[PDB]
Design an enzyme around this catalytic site. Sequence first.
Site, PDB file in Angstrom:
ATOM      1  N   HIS A 196      20.925  15.465 -50.686  1.00  0.00           N
ATOM      2  CA  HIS A 196      22.285  15.396 -50.167  1.00  0.00           C
ATOM      3  C   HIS A 196      23.254  15.697 -51.290  1.00  0.00           C
ATOM      4  O   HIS A 196      23.211  15.043 -52.334  1.00  0.00           O
ATOM      5  CB  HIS A 196      22.624  14.004 -49.620  1.00  0.00           C
ATOM      6  CG  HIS A 196      21.823  13.593 -48.423  1.00  0.00           C
ATOM      7  ND1 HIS A 196      21.617  12.270 -48.090  1.00  0.00           N
ATOM      8  CD2 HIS A 196      21.222  14.323 -47.458  1.00  0.00           C
ATOM      9  CE1 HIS A 196      20.895  12.204 -46.986  1.00  0.00           C
ATOM     10  NE2 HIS A 196      20.632  13.436 -46.588  1.00  0.00           N
TER      11      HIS A 196
ATOM     12  N   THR B 214      33.453  11.812 -39.851  1.00  0.00           N
ATOM     13  CA  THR B 214      32.312  12.674 -39.570  1.00  0.00           C
ATOM     14  C   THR B 214      31.926  12.695 -38.102  1.00  0.00           C
ATOM     15  O   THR B 214      31.255  13.639 -37.671  1.00  0.00           O
ATOM     16  CB  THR B 214      31.094  12.183 -40.368  1.00  0.00           C
ATOM     17  OG1 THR B 214      31.523  11.674 -41.637  1.00  0.00           O
ATOM     18  CG2 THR B 214      30.179  13.315 -40.572  1.00  0.00           C
TER      19      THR B 214
ATOM     20  N   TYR C 107      26.561   5.329 -30.215  1.00  0.00           N
ATOM     21  CA  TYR C 107      26.681   6.573 -30.949  1.00  0.00           C
ATOM     22  C   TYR C 107      28.053   6.723 -31.562  1.00  0.00           C
ATOM     23  O   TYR C 107      29.064   6.616 -30.863  1.00  0.00           O
ATOM     24  CB  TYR C 107      26.421   7.752 -30.033  1.00  0.00           C
ATOM     25  CG  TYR C 107      26.687   9.047 -30.747  1.00  0.00           C
ATOM     26  CD1 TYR C 107      25.732   9.599 -31.592  1.00  0.00           C
ATOM     27  CD2 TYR C 107      27.879   9.707 -30.585  1.00  0.00           C
ATOM     28  CE1 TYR C 107      25.965  10.819 -32.244  1.00  0.00           C
ATOM     29  CE2 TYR C 107      28.145  10.896 -31.226  1.00  0.00           C
ATOM     30  CZ  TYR C 107      27.164  11.461 -32.044  1.00  0.00           C
ATOM     31  OH  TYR C 107      27.451  12.626 -32.687  1.00  0.00           O
TER      32      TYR C 107
ATOM     33  N   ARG D   9      21.246   9.658 -35.654  1.00  0.00           N
ATOM     34  CA  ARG D   9      19.781   9.737 -35.768  1.00  0.00           C
ATOM     35  C   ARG D   9      19.159   8.401 -35.359  1.00  0.00           C
ATOM     36  O   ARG D   9      18.304   7.827 -36.056  1.00  0.00           O
ATOM     37  CB  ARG D   9      19.380  10.157 -37.188  1.00  0.00           C
ATOM     38  CG  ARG D   9      17.933  10.648 -37.309  1.00  0.00           C
ATOM     39  CD  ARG D   9      17.759  11.583 -38.510  1.00  0.00           C
ATOM     40  NE  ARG D   9      17.649  10.817 -39.741  1.00  0.00           N
ATOM     41  CZ  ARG D   9      17.708  11.342 -40.957  1.00  0.00           C
ATOM     42  NH1 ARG D   9      17.870  12.644 -41.110  1.00  0.00           N
ATOM     43  NH2 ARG D   9      17.619  10.562 -42.021  1.00  0.00           N
TER      44      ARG D   9
ATOM     45  N   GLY E 126      30.561  18.772 -35.788  1.00  0.00           N
ATOM     46  CA  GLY E 126      31.972  19.098 -35.899  1.00  0.00           C
ATOM     47  C   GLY E 126      32.268  20.519 -35.457  1.00  0.00           C
ATOM     48  O   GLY E 126      31.535  21.463 -35.755  1.00  0.00           O
TER      49      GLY E 126
HETATM   50 MG   LIG Z   1      29.240  22.149 -38.765  1.00  0.00          MG
END
Ligand SMILES: [Mg+2]
Lengths: 495, 499
Positions: free
Chosen positions: B378, B405, B429, B449, B465
């Site tokens: 990451h 996010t 969620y 997840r 997004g």
């Molecule tokens: Mg994207």
Amino acid sequence: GAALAETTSREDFRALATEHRVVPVIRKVLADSETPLSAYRKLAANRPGTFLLESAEGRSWSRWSFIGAGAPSALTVRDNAAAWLGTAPEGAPSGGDPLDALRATLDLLKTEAMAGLPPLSSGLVGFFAYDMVRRLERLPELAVDDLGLPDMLLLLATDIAAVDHHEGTITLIANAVNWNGTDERVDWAYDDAVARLDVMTKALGQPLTSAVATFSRPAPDHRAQRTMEEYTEIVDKLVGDIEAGEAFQVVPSQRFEMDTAADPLDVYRILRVTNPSPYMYLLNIPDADGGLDFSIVGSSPEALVTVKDGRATTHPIAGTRWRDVLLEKELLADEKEHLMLVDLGRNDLGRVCRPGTVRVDDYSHIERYSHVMHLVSTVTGELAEDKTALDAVTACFPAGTLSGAPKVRAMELIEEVEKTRRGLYGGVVGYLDFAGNADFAIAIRTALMRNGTAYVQAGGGVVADSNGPYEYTEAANKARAVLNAIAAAATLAEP
Amino acid sequence: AALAETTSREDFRALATEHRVVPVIRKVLADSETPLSAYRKLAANRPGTFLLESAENRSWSRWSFIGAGAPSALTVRDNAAAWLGTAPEGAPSGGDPLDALRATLDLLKTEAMAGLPPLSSGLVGFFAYDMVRRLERLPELAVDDLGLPDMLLLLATDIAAVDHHEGTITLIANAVNWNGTDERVDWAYDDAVARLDVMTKALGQPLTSAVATFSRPAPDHRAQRTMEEYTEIVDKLVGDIEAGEAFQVVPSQRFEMDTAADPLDVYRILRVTNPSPYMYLLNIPDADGGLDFSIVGSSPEALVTVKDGRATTHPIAGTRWREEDVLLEKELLADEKERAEHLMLVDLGRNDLGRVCRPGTVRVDDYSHIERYSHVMHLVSTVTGELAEDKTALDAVTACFPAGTLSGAPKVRAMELIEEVEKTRRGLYGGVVGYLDFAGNADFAIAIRTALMRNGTAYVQAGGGVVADSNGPYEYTEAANKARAVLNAIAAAATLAEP
Ligand SMILES: [Mg+2]
Ligand SMILES: [Mg+2]
Ligand SMILES: [Mg+2]
């Protein structure tokens, strides 16, 4: 689609066996409710000819632990000749000088590194006694050999379980070993290896009783060879030689013993929780009848030499502290000899490495473990094309930190002042794999357990300014690390 | 003395005079146990139990945490805070759930004691996405078909902390002093010791093997939106972005599948397939003490972590699959496709922490470092600040909630637009899963997840997004593949068998 535990196929095995002396048949399983110790309990059941090797890194336990699930064959010394215990494999080297038989065995089974395997997938796992040096250098014969250990004993580790802590998986490996280089019985060898995987797989399928425990830390009831006064005579003798110029450094030691009914695996457990180290080991050594001769259990903080893909590396330790950044620079600032041993190692690897490839790296880094920290210097080099990992081991053997400098003169004086042959103490414990790699720990902070007695030897470097009582005490403290673990293991109980 | 020596009555008494939550502890050697075997012995999937683990930047962290069974949970019933199981005497209830939770943490606030594992008591559980409706005015257009509560937090008083490096387990049974009196100190000590003995006895039992093989069949699953339907949503949002309503918006859809799998077996497949900094299994109790549902997940991304008055977020800028590993690192560092989207989120994090931190302490480190895990790496940024003296860990969680996010920028307009385009309320969620400890710390993962397993159905929601240049088919598939990571694990878990 493909199952996790898909076994190496007969077809893939066939193709490898046309090219490779030692062919692994492998099977990976999900073992996320097993530890290396629980897997050892199921796969090895503390039987003769089994082993457990673990390594603390400075990030706790390394990815892999290694279980030797049970070796039918071991290469050792009997009546001064190389001999096999258990099954003597047809066509394997035997008789004559043990180092020559070992060399011949490693040459015969030499197999190209194969991708996709755990770091150790087959090899010879065991020890060289300190006294193997008697075959590399002429030394007096004064000390009494009362332990009767062989110069070497190496388990032929063909059934291995490799425990991957990160994944929670175990890779089971059953190697086919082609001693005579024929193509005659490929299918038999595949079926043989698959049957051995099935034995290990069934073993892992068994339930297991709890080992959740408490223990206390009583004083060890033990005996020593030397009183403080006697050890002081030794230290003073050696300080004389050092002042007269006979040596710069010498490492004497003595042996401690205690009665114990503790199981070696329980001793291992206490060492693991108390003294986690880069070289943890339990070896159950078989006698010629398939019973247990003795066990070796240890937590050694120092390697003799590691060989990986043609590169040899050594990490002589300058000093160590109890583990916080002020203990660190407090050790870099200790100008109190280290580099005489870095000199011994530079020479030692020079005898087996390509010219100019031997690099030194003065005080290259610190090594922080759980309860201690080490200051190490690194010596590496590239092995010559006619040199093996075994040559690296014999060139470096025994550790200078365990003998002295000059090494041969140091060993002569050791033989003069000590009472008994060292046996394992100051030798090595580790492995030579079939791909030409090796990793050997110096055999310190180690117990030899045999028929209800544990032996623990310890020592320390003597220089010109050395004081007898201080060195006696330092060495006894090293021994007590193991004696304490043995005493504590006797107390293990359910909470 | 003995390894497993229990906190003495006399030490407990002395602590109980100064501290609201007092741990009685017992450490045991458990070198043949793993966190999963200890969970199977101690918790055994009972309602009110939990497992929390964390991969670290490149192994499992030192500690794993088992909640061995919480008699009490703070949740929402009929739009008000309510306790499930035992309602403790004097404990906050009624009114707004965040007020009741704030009042609970205030009451139980206890100085961090030396010599304890990192999490020794606290409230463990989740906030649903829809908790945001108590924080912001949002339309009511999407259908609430899951019926989840806006929060449920287990009062985790019996904990087993598993120390992977030592091979030991520290068993903790906390005494909770709700009314602040010293009337029942010896009863409290005896009750805690009794709880320790239950856990100790459980660890003493034998255990059947769980050594296993599994395969990876395709999951038989259902979706709410086809690719074409999802494309209509993406195209609509791109239009709103072009019109200036927002910079970016995160739509999603829900997937589901039938399953008879044990939630711990789903957990096991996620664990071996993609270890993450936030692994969790929560067995959520219903009001009668049965199992309402389980939550199992491996979220890669935190909402916020609060430790010792410092709040930090680590928005993820990008990910790669793991010497050919050095090249992927280089590629990851040089990939700029989503840079503006990422910097917009970093900016939101600055807004959020600004609301709770002492002026001048909010610091932003754009693209600060790479975090290396077993199967992924990451690239992350860091936003951090020092909490203001009148602000708690919970205030930081609520200031950050929900993650940018999972919503968009500006956050409120993005949530309005989500409400306009999604079919169902999100439920868990886009919320969080994690804990608030009794010492003022907190650590919450974004709820992605993640599967919600209830009565033979597993729900998995996923999204991504949308920005001005997004296209429908690409975004549909990227989100569907996120969901498939969990759906795949569920389908694999059904195949677990002896090798
Ligand atoms: Mg994207
Ligand atoms: Mg010294
Ligand atoms: Mg702003």
